[PDB]
């Protein structure tokens, strides 16, 4: 019954305070994806775990071209929940539907094009080492490079 | 189309390059042996990826995620997820994450197997911090 799934969940989480481990929050732990809004392609950013993580959907409607960006410091992951993509990592190409997943790793280039006429919806993490960015830099000065 | 997608990849190092595989359709994921899983993706310290499938009925029972983030992609079924004794009912495109420091379970409550793709990531500098991890690395 689609009544009992809601759209949003909100819950009281522990909050891995090191001085408090029984210090609680409520935190939004969920989401049912078509039901989100989002802001040529869409996105809204869901789960954030600054500065390690953070993850949210993706939506490209037919005939959407996403041009080649950089992962940079960034692992990519991607799931493809609807639709078509031709996607290129690094001048290798690939297609993928439904259940298809695909990494873009650290310091990479890549790129997504719809290729279907049903808009195609993502599911993104993206996620960072803090440890060895402190210790390499992000690229930034002085450590471009 | 493909199963396994091969690629050269830039090793962040600073050209050096590599064979990894970067792509899988999950569908033809074999996978290992109550709940079945499948690593696919490792980028050792800070992240991982894999397929989990839960056959009906199945119950995966309370751990704790400790010093990591874990998200859930629903591809197939209907679960029912407990996070720090909350229970609350999700099915397929519906995603959850389970915070740091904290408890959780997951059961299969429908007819069909259960699906997911996870991801978990940890925050090295904080694990740093805390003295987590031994000198081996």
Same mark, same amino acid.
């Given at each position: 019954?689609?009544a009992?799934?809601?759209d949003?969940?909100?819950?009281?989480?522990?909050s891995?305070?090191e001085?408090?481990?029984?210090?609680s929050e409520? &935190?939004?732990? %969920?989401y049912?994806?078509?039901s989100?809004?989002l802001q040529?392609?869409?996105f809204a950013?869901?789960?954030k775990?600054?500065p390690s993580?953070?993850? %949210?959907?993706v939506?490209?409607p037919?005939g959407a071209e996403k041009?080649?960006?950089?992962?940079?410091?960034? $692992?990519?992951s991607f799931?493809i929940?609807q639709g078509?993509?031709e996607?290129?990592?690094?001048?290798?190409?690939?297609?993928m539907?439904?259940?298809?997943?695909?990494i873009?790793p650290? %310091?990479?280039?890549y790129?997504?094009?719809? $290729? %279907?006429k049903?808009?195609?919806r993502?599911?993104?993490?993206?996620?960072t080492?803090?440890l060895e960015?402190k &210790? &390499?830099?992000?690229?930034d000065?002085?450590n471009?490079r």
């Amino acid at each position: 019954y689609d009544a009992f799934y809601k759209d949003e969940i909100n819950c009281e989480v522990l909050s891995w305070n090191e001085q408090n481990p029984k210090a609680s929050e409520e &935190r939004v732990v %969920g989401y049912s994806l078509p039901s989100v809004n989002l802001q040529q392609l869409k996105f809204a950013s869901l789960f954030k775990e600054e500065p390690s993580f953070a993850a %949210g959907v993706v939506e490209m409607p037919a005939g959407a071209e996403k041009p080649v960006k950089p992962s940079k410091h960034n $692992i990519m992951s991607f799931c493809i929940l609807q639709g078509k993509i031709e996607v290129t990592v690094n001048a290798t190409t690939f297609r993928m539907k439904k259940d298809g997943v695909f990494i873009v790793p650290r %310091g990479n280039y890549y790129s997504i094009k719809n $290729i %279907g006429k049903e808009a195609v919806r993502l599911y993104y993490t993206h996620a960072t080492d803090t440890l060895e960015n402190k &210790r &390499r830099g992000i690229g930034d000065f002085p450590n471009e490079r």
